[PDB]
Design an enzyme around this catalytic site. Structure first.
Site, PDB file in Angstrom:
ATOM      1  CG  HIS B 186      -2.148  -0.919   1.009  1.00 41.64           C
ATOM      2  ND1 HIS B 186      -2.190  -2.209   1.485  1.00 41.64           N
ATOM      3  CD2 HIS B 186      -3.333  -0.698   0.406  1.00 41.64           C
ATOM      4  CE1 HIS B 186      -3.348  -2.750   1.176  1.00 41.64           C
ATOM      5  NE2 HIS B 186      -4.068  -1.844   0.516  1.00 41.64           N
ATOM      6  CB  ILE B 187       3.492   2.341   2.362  1.00 42.01           C
ATOM      7  CG1 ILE B 187       2.528   2.511   3.536  1.00 42.01           C
ATOM      8  CG2 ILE B 187       4.635   3.337   2.391  1.00 42.01           C
ATOM      9  CD1 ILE B 187       3.160   2.169   4.884  1.00 42.01           C
ATOM     10  CG  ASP B 206       6.550  -7.498  -2.804  1.00 40.21           C
ATOM     11  OD1 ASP B 206       6.252  -8.648  -2.420  1.00 40.21           O
ATOM     12  OD2 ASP B 206       6.055  -6.479  -2.325  1.00 40.21           O
ATOM     13  CB  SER B 264       9.005  -1.068   7.178  1.00 34.84           C
ATOM     14  OG  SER B 264      10.316  -1.556   7.459  1.00 34.84           O
ATOM     15  CD  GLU B 294       9.241   2.141  18.036  1.00 36.55           C
ATOM     16  OE1 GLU B 294       8.084   2.653  18.284  1.00 36.55           O
ATOM     17  OE2 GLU B 294       9.635   1.828  16.885  1.00 36.55           O
ATOM     18  CG  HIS B 325       6.295   4.229  15.378  1.00 32.04           C
ATOM     19  ND1 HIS B 325       6.697   2.959  15.713  1.00 32.04           N
ATOM     20  CD2 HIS B 325       5.332   4.087  14.445  1.00 32.04           C
ATOM     21  CE1 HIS B 325       6.008   2.084  15.015  1.00 32.04           C
ATOM     22  NE2 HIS B 325       5.166   2.750  14.229  1.00 32.04           N
ATOM     23  CB  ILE B 326       6.188  10.873  13.642  1.00 32.75           C
ATOM     24  CG1 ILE B 326       7.548  11.188  13.018  1.00 32.75           C
ATOM     25  CG2 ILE B 326       6.256  11.127  15.134  1.00 32.75           C
ATOM     26  CD1 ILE B 326       7.565  11.210  11.522  1.00 32.75           C
ATOM     27  N   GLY B 327       5.521   8.064  11.351  1.00 38.11           N
ATOM     28  CA  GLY B 327       5.128   7.745   9.988  1.00 38.11           C
ATOM     29  C   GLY B 327       3.660   8.040   9.661  1.00 38.11           C
TER      30      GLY B 327
HETATM   31  N1  LIG Z   1       6.347   3.925  10.458  1.00 42.40           N
HETATM   32  C1  LIG Z   1       5.039   3.868  10.726  1.00 42.40           C
HETATM   33  O1  LIG Z   1       4.491   4.632  11.535  1.00 42.40           O
HETATM   34  C2  LIG Z   1       4.167   2.963   9.910  1.00 42.40           C
HETATM   35  C3  LIG Z   1       2.905   3.377   9.487  1.00 42.40           C
HETATM   36  C4  LIG Z   1       2.140   2.552   8.677  1.00 42.40           C
HETATM   37  C5  LIG Z   1       2.607   1.302   8.318  1.00 42.40           C
HETATM   38  N2  LIG Z   1       3.854   0.892   8.736  1.00 42.40           N
HETATM   39  C6  LIG Z   1       4.418  -0.388   8.290  1.00 42.40           C
HETATM   40  O2  LIG Z   1       4.886  -0.263   6.939  1.00 42.40           O
HETATM   41  C7  LIG Z   1       4.974  -1.597   6.395  1.00 42.40           C
HETATM   42  C8  LIG Z   1       4.243  -1.609   5.083  1.00 42.40           C
HETATM   43  O3  LIG Z   1       2.851  -1.390   5.332  1.00 42.40           O
HETATM   44  P1  LIG Z   1       1.863  -1.502   4.072  1.00 42.40           P
HETATM   45  O4  LIG Z   1       0.511  -1.017   4.450  1.00 42.40           O
HETATM   46  O5  LIG Z   1       2.432  -0.881   2.824  1.00 42.40           O
HETATM   47  O6  LIG Z   1       1.852  -3.098   3.900  1.00 42.40           O
HETATM   48  P2  LIG Z   1       1.372  -4.129   2.750  1.00 42.40           P
HETATM   49  O7  LIG Z   1       1.088  -5.402   3.458  1.00 42.40           O
HETATM   50  O8  LIG Z   1       0.325  -3.545   1.863  1.00 42.40           O
HETATM   51  O9  LIG Z   1       2.719  -4.292   1.889  1.00 42.40           O
HETATM   52  C9  LIG Z   1       3.892  -5.014   2.341  1.00 42.40           C
HETATM   53  C10 LIG Z   1       4.565  -5.614   1.127  1.00 42.40           C
HETATM   54  O10 LIG Z   1       5.814  -6.206   1.567  1.00 42.40           O
HETATM   55  C11 LIG Z   1       6.028  -7.352   0.779  1.00 42.40           C
HETATM   56  N3  LIG Z   1       7.025  -8.178   1.439  1.00 42.40           N
HETATM   57  C12 LIG Z   1       6.846  -9.011   2.514  1.00 42.40           C
HETATM   58  N4  LIG Z   1       7.951  -9.584   2.920  1.00 42.40           N
HETATM   59  C13 LIG Z   1       8.918  -9.078   2.066  1.00 42.40           C
HETATM   60  C14 LIG Z   1      10.297  -9.304   1.991  1.00 42.40           C
HETATM   61  N5  LIG Z   1      10.924 -10.116   2.841  1.00 42.40           N
HETATM   62  N6  LIG Z   1      10.991  -8.630   1.029  1.00 42.40           N
HETATM   63  C15 LIG Z   1      10.320  -7.821   0.197  1.00 42.40           C
HETATM   64  N7  LIG Z   1       9.020  -7.522   0.179  1.00 42.40           N
HETATM   65  C16 LIG Z   1       8.370  -8.196   1.151  1.00 42.40           C
HETATM   66  C17 LIG Z   1       4.650  -7.976   0.647  1.00 42.40           C
HETATM   67  O11 LIG Z   1       4.655  -8.870  -0.426  1.00 42.40           O
HETATM   68  C18 LIG Z   1       3.800  -6.734   0.369  1.00 42.40           C
HETATM   69  O12 LIG Z   1       3.575  -6.592  -1.039  1.00 42.40           O
HETATM   70  C19 LIG Z   1       4.391  -2.530   7.482  1.00 42.40           C
HETATM   71  O13 LIG Z   1       5.360  -3.065   8.383  1.00 42.40           O
HETATM   72  C20 LIG Z   1       3.459  -1.576   8.250  1.00 42.40           C
HETATM   73  O14 LIG Z   1       3.166  -1.939   9.588  1.00 42.40           O
HETATM   74  C21 LIG Z   1       4.636   1.712   9.527  1.00 42.40           C
END
Ligand SMILES: NC(=O)c1ccc[n+]([C@@H]2O[C@H](COP(=O)([O-])OP(=O)(O)OC[C@H]3O[C@@H](n4cnc5c(N)ncnc54)[C@H](O)[C@@H]3O)[C@@H](O)[C@H]2O)c1
Ligand SMILES: NC(=O)c1ccc[n+]([C@@H]2O[C@H](COP(=O)([O-])OP(=O)(O)OC[C@H]3O[C@@H](n4cnc5c(N)ncnc54)[C@H](O)[C@@H]3O)[C@@H](O)[C@H]2O)c1
Ligand SMILES: NC(=O)c1ccc[n+]([C@@H]2O[C@H](COP(=O)([O-])OP(=O)(O)OC[C@H]3O[C@@H](n4cnc5c(N)ncnc54)[C@H](O)[C@@H]3O)[C@@H](O)[C@H]2O)c1
Ligand SMILES: NC(=O)c1ccc[n+]([C@@H]2O[C@H](COP(=O)([O-])OP(=O)(O)OC[C@H]3O[C@@H](n4cnc5c(N)ncnc54)[C@H](O)[C@@H]3O)[C@@H](O)[C@H]2O)c1
Ligand SMILES: O=C(O)CC[C@@H](O)C(=O)O
Lengths: 446, 447, 419, 444
Positions: B186-187, B206, B264, B294, B325-327
């Site tokens: 998604h991100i 990926d 992440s 954290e 953690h302000i993402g």
């Molecule tokens: N920093 C923050 O405050 C904050 C905020 C929101 C989300 N996040 C984190 O960001 C990350 C991504 O969230 P998202 O909504 O985009 O997730 P998502 O599940 O939509 O996408 C994650 C992607 O990573 C891929 N993936 C999994 N294992 C992998 C690997 N070993 N190597 C390469 N690709 C791999 C998956 O196939 C998937 O396409 C998550 O850990 C989520 O918790 C952090």
């Protein structure tokens, strides 16, 4: 009430970049002169060194400026000199430059050069006004986001051990409105980036300017201040821009809006910004430029002795301060290299003075490879009556294919293409033009 | 034979040919149980949520932080729905006291703070917000790319202490550079489009084949991405495979003066190896939003050598951006979570809709019209064993069932049934009969 | 926003296909392993009766009438595909009464109509039709007067639905400004603007086009007073429904030089078949008048007549019938409750079509009560209802027992078990 | 294993209004009022621009008999024409006052350009004003051919109802092959992508694509891969019949051909044959080898092009009479371009964009440059003429001067300061009796 002709106007039919199938330009070499010596100071970029060496010019390079007495000795032999901001080419120094054809300012500023004295000796000065545009536009995109999320504050906290997670008053920039003051080279570039990051763009300019994309020109600055979340300045230093954002403009802005100035150090009244932030009217600000800046890098350079409100400014939340780094990238320094070295090179090889800052702007289409026996006359002279009479008399045995003279103050510049000239006649024309009384400097390219 | 007319089949003569193609008002319903609905919201959920609940007419109690365990126990006795975020731990110790609780809202992505299985066992549905922070993180990264490219953080810290240090050396325009996205989710996919618009080339790695947005390109190995990228950013889940997936050998695979961004998960980068790569001038800068350890709360001496031992080392390095953690910490993100989860809890309470629940069967039915008088909706949470629909559909057999949907999730199942032509006498009779079936976990009737 | 604030956010199965459905459908059915009989036209009634007694699914288009007279003999029929929008050729209620689900394709022709309109906009703007007809008879008539570039002009879309919203994006790309009128508030695509009255749209539009259903409100909704509200030399396009424009008033508006041109795809009366004297004064009396006018484009209901549209219908309806046969999924059915369930060993799916009366789930869930029901969904549509249940741990002996019990319930209309 | 390093660096402004100094307005010396004659129904935008200058304007909707044209042209300072007025030497010999000619169209062959240059008469035209109009025509013909619209309408207008979806297509997903990615081709490219076509183009030059169009290295790759093929090329010997029998054999079965470029670029007998063989499914032609000179009722027939009766009897053929640029917007833009050009040449001597003349111009004089005159001296490109001229002007400072040559003609433009009215008349009479002189005006 009736269907009718749309507003259509012929200059909107454009064509994409293509490859001409041109004739090879004839390459031209000066009469009587030997090797061109270039002196480059203050760590001009390697792109410039390369362009000059590929012409076969002799190039001497230095990473800093020279003592005045050393500069005097070196400049005696030199045909072109490249500088940046810290080399002062006064009359004291330029009086000894007997061979100098042109000066390159590898930067925007040209005040370090006595432009009028230089013009008086037939020395053309070139600079790079617009090479830093992308670098400043990207800086601003980054500061918009950084201010929107208080990144600077977060990092400073964490670097000293404070964990302070905050969502309050931190925003996604998508959907917000950017107000651009000055829709010039930087402003119009920033406009396209800002739309791509999902901001709505308004701009205020003193001129009617065709928008890029879906930006909207507003007729007053107060509409812009009223309707913008982020306000950014991309204007010149004029008396009208002098302190154009002050207390009344900050009152016209939204509560918790943001101010960005990477234009000029005079355009914002800082005491009033400090006060607007302290009153929680302005939520943050980024400044790249100040009324007073140090001459050199150093450790206690930015303080109350340079600008008195420094200790106040520094103690505020969500303030990004940068030391005039708007154009400080490798790509910008490299583009300046190419722009100015190409400019000096076209002036030396073809006499083209377009973009000169202290000189008439004259140029002529290149001669073809196969135009045998054609010479180009480059005649810099005093802007007084009777000089074209003299010159066109000297050349009257030969057909003049074309000719362009223009004036700038007390100096003028003639450029003429004459056909069917053999080497005997070339020497004769040179010596005649060299003993006219209006002459400042003459060069013939063949 | 028919193998020439088969290689000139999936190839063609050359022929033009068909392209490859590809109101009523909802009746509002109220439970049979007396005394309305108390919502408890903790940890400073967004005002969008408070508003949605008050407009339903629920009584709402709001707190900006979490509660001591003993205070939380007493409050939760009366509460019908509770909204939390990451720091409130709904254990069985606490939920055992929640006699009225119909559902839990996690106003955040994580649900581990809740004992989901114990909750399901009592017929308590749990809801969360997985994908609300996407744009916020993608924008953060665009800003850190630029900030790292230009050493903005370093410049400002210098100036704030009086040092004027103008530097163009190894400071860059991001136009033309290459961004390597690890995890095109998604991100990652959102960041991809932004990064192209800022004039970067985008490569991504990926573990799955994913259709590119724009002109991004998928590379088959991570090392190809590390080799070819100027900026590397991580948007992956926390799995054993992502655990420390960037370590010393990956930093050796990266370019001299490349940059690392991790918003992440706290575990995905080996920090001592990053510190060492920066010290060796291999890595030119880094931005971290997430750490192995954290603090639980905001505070002044929270981020130090006792929490992560390499802290004093990390902080003394140039061109390092650290964020707590302000993402997803924006008004827009917090506000969207507010709306998603409060809408979910509200539709579960008012209509029994459990779609998007993380610990429950996902069941819902079209709303009844305004004018459907005498229709009741049965919400029957029971044990997933044979013979329960026999019992229930027997109890309801005097009434026409307009529709019904039951689904199971482990040992729990959830029936939802719309029955027409029911007067108030018959409603109380159905309730008491369903309330004394042995498969029953919890029952509610909406009319 | 006077303060910075938050931003907004299986080979047993016989298929019979009639009336030249597209090959995409034939292929989907043969890949399932169904036996397929295909015809390019419809069948005489007596031949259709004989064929249908063994057919499990039938695909038709507009000209095959599935009356009660015919469906009474369809002992095996599970479903009907209408490879088209219209379903009136089928007695939907009789069909539902026998437990026969009917499917159609409502929205497959959207792009085809939207492109037709973009083409007619340009064609009318430049009088292309008139130019070509002239040249084909030897007349050279170069004309710039009142011919226009569509860039800058305004398109007024009446009905911002599947077609209208698609047309909107195309029209903006061709550089028209788009206004639309609808009876509902609809979020605009791109930079189109919803206008609150039709008269504002008529006043401000150069081209007006109709993409509305046939309701009593759309019946003749463009008549003499609407043409008076439009601009001098504006243009009218109707590829919606044959009734929505009052043609005698359009003819009169064109004759008065109020309306500069028009394109019609649809008429009050249309022939049943292609033919040479079909479109004349006996079908619509103003035909000879209409035909004698300049800058009038007439098409015979070809708005959806493309290979791509016919092909998409093929895929939509054949996939629908296939998921109904293979999984019992009735979503998108036009005469049936809409029921479906997410798609290891020893699980059976019960498909029980029944009369919508009290006590039927009591009966059925009793019969199944020895087995765990993993999930179950029943819904009603008039006098008919449809139960779908997934039951686990069922061997083939127990399956036959459940079948015979359900087959002798009195509410039963039809039953099928899938395993 | 890599190193981060300087990107490959390649800054315009968007169009804006100048806040310079007010231009000094200049009036010719020995002349009174400028008379403009406009023929062949030039657009009103032109009439307006000329009257706002204060020129006297005579307008005609058609061309003039030769004897009437001769009498009118004796007094006229500028003449606007289009394609059907032939300005021969026979006629231009009597043009004693004529300063310039406007061709309110692309073509200039109706004017004897060399004779005109020899008398110091500058000729202007409008090359690129019809681009959008042609591009939109083509988008419309693509769709019309894809759906056989023309055939459907002709049927219905005669009473035949013939609903057909067979070999009728949605243009989304199809491929457009553009031959000639110039002003028209590149504009069409962007439209076609927006309508969901994939765009290939063939050009004899490497041209940077707009959008996601792709340049193909050979024409046959384009013919092989395109559903619709359209021509936007000049008339050269290489484009002469560049689509003939072998090119139609290289195209797809049931593909389509569009030619709104030039009448010679398609071999029509071979197109007719390809359509008859069901190779080509339809075609649209705007241009023909022979075209009538005027509109009329029996103009397009076997006596003009012999294959006419054959061509017209074929299905899915769209025929238009050179209407590619026939819009109000195009005619209006021509009006503005050419009237502005003539006006800048008359008022300031600016000959940039002239088709038969040296291209010379100088920045406008400021309002506050009192006593400055501009010398416009058209002479013969022979040695010693600037000697003579700069001698005559040598009592005055020359602020600037630009001379350029084009064959046997050259054009000097000089700005001289501190000149009173006595001295102006003296300079005029001296320059007027130089031997190299072709024509002279002074603006003051
Ligand atoms: N920093 C923050 O405050 C904050 C905020 C929101 C989300 N996040 C984190 O960001 C990350 C991504 O969230 P998202 O909504 O985009 O997730 P998502 O599940 O939509 O996408 C994650 C992607 O990573 C891929 N993936 C999994 N294992 C992998 C690997 N070993 N190597 C390469 N690709 C791999 C998956 O196939 C998937 O396409 C998550 O850990 C989520 O918790 C952090
Ligand atoms: N911070 C840095 O390191 C850095 C680097 C490069 C350029 N700059 C500065 O940024 C500014 C803009 O550079 P540029 O190339 O975009 O300038 P530009 O000349 O291309 O355009 C400046 C714009 O300002 C407008 N303008 C002038 N006066 C105005 C006024 N009073 N109100 C509103 N608009 C007004 C002009 O019309 C023009 O559109 C200049 O001051 C330049 O020196 C700073
Ligand atoms: N000519 C053809 O061959 C052809 C092919 C396909 C579809 N169609 C027809 O085109 C029309 C539009 O089809 P669609 O798929 O877009 O339908 P749709 O139902 O998606 O669109 C109808 C729209 O019109 C609006 N509307 C209804 N009544 C209205 C009124 N009185 N005034 C204004 N707006 C009104 C609706 O709210 C809706 O947004 C229908 O009549 C459809 O049957 C014709
Ligand atoms: N039908 C009309 O009424 C009408 C209106 C306007 C223009 N035109 C004509 O359309 C054509 C296009 O006009 P334009 O403004 O785009 O022209 P242009 O000169 O901008 O473009 C012509 C393009 O053709 C390319 N080219 C030249 N020879 C070629 C060849 N043999 N094969 C492939 N490409 C070749 C050139 O490199 C150039 O890119 C011209 O013939 C013009 O006269 C017709
Ligand atoms: O598909 C057909 O049979 C033609 C008529 C059809 O448009 C319909 O009724 O939807």
């Amino acid at each position: 009430g009736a269907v009718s002709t749309s507003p259509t106007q012929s200059f909107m039919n454009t064509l994409p970049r293509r490859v001409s199938i041109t004739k090879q330009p004839k390459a031209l070499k000066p009469f009587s002169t030997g090797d061109m010596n270039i002196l480059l100071l203050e760590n001009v970029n390697a792109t410039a060194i390369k362009i000059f060496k590929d012409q076969g010019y002799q190039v001497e390079f230095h990473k800093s400026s020279l003592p005045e007495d050393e500069l005097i000795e070196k400049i005696k032999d030199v045909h072109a000199i490249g500088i940046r901001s810290k080399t002062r080419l006064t009359e004291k120094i330029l009086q000894h430059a007997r061979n100098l054809v042109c000066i390159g300012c590898f930067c925007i500023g040209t005040n370090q050069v006595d432009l009028k004295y230089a013009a008086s000796k037939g020395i053309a000065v070139f600079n790079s006004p617009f090479s830093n545009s992308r670098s400043v536009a990207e800086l601003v995109i980054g500061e918009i986001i950084s201010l929107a999320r208080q990144l600077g504050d977060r990092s400073i906290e964490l670097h000293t051990g404070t964990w302070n997670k905050v969502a309050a008053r931190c925003w996604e920039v998508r959907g917000k409105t950017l107000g651009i003051i000055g829709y010039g080279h930087i402003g119009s570039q920033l406009s396209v980036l800002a739309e791509a990051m999902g901001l709505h763009v308004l701009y205020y300019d003193i001129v009617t300017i065709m928008a890029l994309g879906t930006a909207r020109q507003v007729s007053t600055l107060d509409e812009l201040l009223n309707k913008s979340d982020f306000v950014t300045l991309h204007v010149p230093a004029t008396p009208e821009t002098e302190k154009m954002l002050s207390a009344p403009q900050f009152a016209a802005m939204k509560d918790g809006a943001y101010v960005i100035n990477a234009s000029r150090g005079t355009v914002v009244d800082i005491p009033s910004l400090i006060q607007a932030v302290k009153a929680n009217k302005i939520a943050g600000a980024a400044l790249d430029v100040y009324p007073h800046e140090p001459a050199k890098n150093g450790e206690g350079s930015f303080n109350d002795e340079l600008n008195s409100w420094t200790s106040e400014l520094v103690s505020l939340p969500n303030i990004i301060l940068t030391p005039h780094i708007g154009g400080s990238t490798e790509e910008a320094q490299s583009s300046i290299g190419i722009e100015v070295a190409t400019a000096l090179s076209k002036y030396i090889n073809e006499g083209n003075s377009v973009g000169s800052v202290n000189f008439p702007e004259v140029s002529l289409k290149s001669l073809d490879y196969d135009q045998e026996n054609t010479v180009r006359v480059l005649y810099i002279h005093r802007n007084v009556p009777g000089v074209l009479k003299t010159v066109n008399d000297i050349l009257s045995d030969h057909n003049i294919e074309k000719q362009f003279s223009d004036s700038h103050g007390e100096i003028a510049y003639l450029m003429a293409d004459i056909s069917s000239v053999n080497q005997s006649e070339i020497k004769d024309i040179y010596e005649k033009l060299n003993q006219t009384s209006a002459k400042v400097s003459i060069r013939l390219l063949y």
